[PDB]
Design an enzyme around this catalytic site. Sequence first.
Site, PDB file in Angstrom:
ATOM      1  N   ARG A  38      -0.243  10.325  -2.871  1.00 36.89           N
ATOM      2  CA  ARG A  38      -0.946  10.088  -1.612  1.00 36.89           C
ATOM      3  C   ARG A  38      -1.591  11.364  -1.079  1.00 36.89           C
ATOM      4  NH1 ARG A  38       2.491   5.109   1.313  1.00 36.89           N
ATOM      5  NH2 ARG A  38       4.212   5.110  -0.197  1.00 36.89           N
ATOM      6  N   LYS A 213       9.102 -16.351  -2.324  1.00 40.61           N
ATOM      7  CA  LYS A 213       9.221 -17.430  -1.356  1.00 40.61           C
ATOM      8  C   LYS A 213       7.851 -18.030  -1.074  1.00 40.61           C
ATOM      9  CE  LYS A 213      12.918 -15.302   1.327  1.00 40.61           C
ATOM     10  NZ  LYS A 213      13.300 -13.971   1.885  1.00 40.61           N
ATOM     11  N   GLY A 371       1.772  -3.092  -2.614  1.00 42.07           N
ATOM     12  CA  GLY A 371       3.121  -3.579  -2.833  1.00 42.07           C
ATOM     13  C   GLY A 371       3.547  -3.427  -4.286  1.00 42.07           C
ATOM     14  N   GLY A 394       1.365  -4.589   3.136  1.00 44.09           N
ATOM     15  CA  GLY A 394       1.279  -5.467   4.290  1.00 44.09           C
ATOM     16  C   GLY A 394      -0.132  -5.586   4.833  1.00 44.09           C
TER      17      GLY A 394
END
Length: 414
Positions: A38, A213, A371, A394
């Site tokens: 980063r 999920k 992610g 996110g």
Amino acid sequence: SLSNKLTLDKLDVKGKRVVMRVDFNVPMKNNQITNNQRIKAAVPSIKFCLDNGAKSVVLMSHLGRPDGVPMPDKYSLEPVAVELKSLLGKDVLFLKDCVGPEVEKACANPAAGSVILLENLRFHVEEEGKGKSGNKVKAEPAKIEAFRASLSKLGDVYVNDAFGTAHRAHSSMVGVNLPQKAGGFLMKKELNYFAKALESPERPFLAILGGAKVADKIQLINNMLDKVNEMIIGGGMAFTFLKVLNNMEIGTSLFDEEGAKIVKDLMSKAEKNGVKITLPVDFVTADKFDENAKTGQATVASGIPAGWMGLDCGPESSKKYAEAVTRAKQIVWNGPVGVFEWEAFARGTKALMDEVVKATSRGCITIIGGGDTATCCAKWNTEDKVSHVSTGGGASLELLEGKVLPGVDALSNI
């Protein structure tokens, strides 16, 4: 719309003070840097500002989950300023705080070309607006305003190069009140690729969605069904589909009781909009949810036996996924199709990654979500063999779900 916001390259920085939100959330131990990806990523923006005659570059960032309590022993940006010093080839002043009269005096009028790094922003509850031996505790509107004015005092123009935090209405994201708020080069990259994906994508457009999920991804899938031409539904999700659509036996595998109720509604929307849905057809089973568990194989026809669970797709499912990827001119992939952390159940994800690499090679636009799928791109060294790898999980998910980003929205138009 995501494209017509102000970027650093269209900003005039000669002689001004640049205050810039960067992404230095490098998660490593011993206060020694093991992966400064980063930091290396944020370098071209700082170098642009310096090589265009800016008076100073002030860098605010975060690291850890301190929830607004000063933790300089365990989560301090100090080693980063050392790392940066090497990568920039230039002295970098490290300050012990990011607000207050001392930091404001330090950044009021520095020497020409100075580079300054502030202490972790999340030492204050006012950054996130809420935090925590103190248990959960909140912030105070006047104090949030004071924190935001203190950051606003540190420079003449503002640059946001922290895409991974751009979905959070945080003070450093939306509380710098300066006449020009530009997006850094990472920001520019993200907005370009995702505005192309969401606004005018090359076609056929394929979305590959995996996850554990179904209930948390509904809106995602829903919005993706307004955009794409094809959808691959993989990962632990698929069993909830297969148990409901094909009455498949799933063993001890993940089952979303709520999402099972909306499976047919999503298939109905897909049929109404003319979207081709590709689900797996074979599986690598495990006796327990463990890394070193006994393995096996199953199909939709055979079903998964009792006591076992499906943790990855099999070769036929890879063939079907490769059929889908072969037809695509634009691809967005968010969430792997198997438990890639464990080598026994990473074959499907690896094969899909190779297929995406080849698709890129013959001209496909391939965007990899933040992610775990970006983690896959890094773990098999293919970040240079795809079009784009997002810097935030996110935030990219919320872009795909169709939402507006508070940090992005707070940039200057034109």
